[model samples]
Target chain A: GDTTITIVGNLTADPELRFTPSGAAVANFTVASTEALFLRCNIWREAAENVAESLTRGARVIVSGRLKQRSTVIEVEVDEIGPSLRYATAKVNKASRS
Target chain B: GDTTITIVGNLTADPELRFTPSGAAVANFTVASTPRIYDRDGEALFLRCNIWREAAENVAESLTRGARVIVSGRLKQRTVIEVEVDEIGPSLRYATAKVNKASRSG
Candidate 1:
């Protein structure tokens, strides 16, 4: 079974990139909707690194991910994220991985 | 901004159909998803969902408790997660459903 969630919201804070013990890149951010629903999202590996480099506080973004329901929180594992074109425009940047 | 979600789960109970004061039909149901996250006790997460108009009537007529379904729609969060459904149907993964199209009014 799989669950997919797509949300457009503003970033609550600047996304922070962190590293695991094995040196895997991970990013975490909080996204708040207009109705004040706040969701914490996690992005892993190359996607995490790229998302962290692109997004900042108050930036409008669209995120598509898997919804993981926890006992106390609803978490999302982000598969794709980009600037939302609803209000603003973004300069496209390509990250070339060697 | 808009949020859309697709969930595959079982109905916690039979759906309820109600009419607004203006006579618009609405259907309410709850979907329970088994946790794939860190759960030691093996509890399921429940989300309340609603749909309007003809779609509401169709869902209430077809689904019951323990029925597996797939729902896709806009997700709204107030006190809970509410889905303004676009489409809903029985999951063919583990269940079967006969096809019937409802008549449209002019």
Candidate 2:
């Protein structure tokens, strides 16, 4: 197990939230990154919900995740992410829903 | 206007700090990482990173073979992909270094 990568980039658009058959929460978003790269990320559970609430189009963020190359594309399973401080400020909150 | 990235992984071997034709210093190291679909069936993403200047020297001095590190950098894919390190240090995960705060005056 060794494919952990972190990339700092801006969202191409808002995160899209969806539900699994088991009703678990998941969010998907794409980042316009280095060398005009567009990377797609899938985050599940609480963090996924948090992503939906805290991010939007063109927001710069520092993202930590595991990358997988399945075909002609690479997909990411995000583990940790937050706004990058170079151009933004954030309010810390631990509030959440079950 | 940023291409920054970061990762936590173990060094594959000792870092190489070498001088270029212009006498500028740069360090090269490789990190072995496991992907999301990672399993013990023999898999890893070993990426080589390059750092320049004082940080490059710092990396050569502070890191060694199999050392775990927290590294931040920018990714410029010129496959082989090239990472220009922004910051790197020993990771505080089950291992500790002789922690020193390096300062460079602008």
Candidate 3:
């Protein structure tokens, strides 16, 4: 099934970046949105590295991705994510992937 | 705050249609979707959705329990995460559909 979702929320804490044994970069973060709903989000590869480098705790962000549900747990496989510009602005720095 | 979301899933049950005192129609339904890495034993999530006006009637008339649909809406928190659906339609992944625009109220 093609399950897509877009969310706008604040990060509960700074994202953690890690590398798999195969050298794949992954970043994990939690987003708290309206009504106290919280979601776990994962970014991979270059995007994961970029998210961990540029974003911080309490940052408002917009994340769009496919919803990955495992039993009772739900997470997002982030496709595109960025800071929300509704109340603030961010500097854009395009980096090349190594 | 603009929170937009799109979801595709199967309807858990037939949608319920109601009319407000002011005569506006509303439809409510629940949808269930599985993860991308779905295991038969793995979990799924259910989302509650609301559609209003003409679309609500169309949805209620055309869809039945277990139907597959795609919905786009604004995310709102009222007790729990709910969708105020702006657009919805059958998922053509499993079937075909005919499109017809809703008539404007004069």
Candidate 4:
């Protein structure tokens, strides 16, 4: 139920923090990465708050999460290229926000 | 400047192919991302990009978007195309993905 994941990218905006019904903390941030191309990354749930506390906008962060697959779509946003980017939120397992 | 970079994950979608002026093949793929924390604004920024080649064929055929993957390769600069030795450039970097080779799968 867990897997290690790592990514380096920049935050598109400030982190948004919230609390779940179970009293757990959650934070949300988006990373824009371009290799030979462009990519968008989302850090969801508990690992989310940890990131907000540890990182900032335009900062690079590496994340390690228990790879949990989601069966549904949450939301979408627009970028410089239009609105092709979708955010798939994950419950954070581990992360290096700074 | 050149550096080594590795990334493990799945593709968010399929890759789009294009052609350069010199007639080389170029492909574009977007990686759906999840992370703990991130930097949104900066100068020494990492980027979104364009991939090309017969060299770029693997990512298109070998690994399907969203298929679990592990990418290891050279990290080069996007502007002048230099890979810095510093800890930066961790962002805007693209990692390679491929199928499980016979060595371990078999």
Q: Indicate which candidate wins on DockQ.
A: 1
Candidate 2 stretches with Cα past 4 Å from truth are A1-65, A69-98, B35-42, B101-106
Model 3 regions more than 4 Å off: A21-23, A33-37, A85-98, B17-26, B32-46, B52-58, B78-80, B91-106
What total of clashing residue pairs does each candidate reach? Answer: 0, 6, 4, 25
User: Model 1: runs farther than 4 Å from truth?
Assistant: A18-25, A33-37, A84-98, B19-25, B34-45, B98-106
Reference-based lDDT, each prediction: 0.82, 0.79, 0.83, 0.42
TM-score of chain A of each: 0.88, 0.89, 0.91, 0.49
RMSD of each: 4.7, 7.3, 5.1, 14.9
What ordering of candidates by lDDT runs from best to worst? 3, 1, 2, 4
RMSD of 3: 5.1
Query: Judged by DockQ cut-offs, is candidate 2 incorrect, acceptable, medium or high?
Result: incorrect
Tens digit of per-residue lDDT, candidate 4, span B1-106: 1224444444556656677689877655543445454556111112123456653554566545555444444344342322211221122245543334345433
For the predicted complex of model 2, DockQ is: 0.21
**DockQ of candidate 4?**
0.03
Model 3 over residues B1-106: C-alpha lDDT tens digits?
5557788788999999989899999999988865455445235678889999888988998988999888888766543567789999898898987767658667
The residue-by-residue lDDT of candidate 2 on B1-106, one tens digit each, is 5656676788999999989899999999987665444435345666678999988878997899999887788666542455688989888876866766668668
TM-score, cand. 1 vs. native: 0.73
Interface RMSD of each: 2.7, 4.1, 3.4, 10.2
Tens digit of per-residue lDDT, candidate 1, span A36-85: 67778899988888888888999988988877766655778889998888
On a 0 to 100 scale, what is the lDDT of residue A25 in model 1? 92
Q: What DockQ would you assign to candidate 1?
A: 0.37
Cα lDDT for residue A48, candidate 2: 88
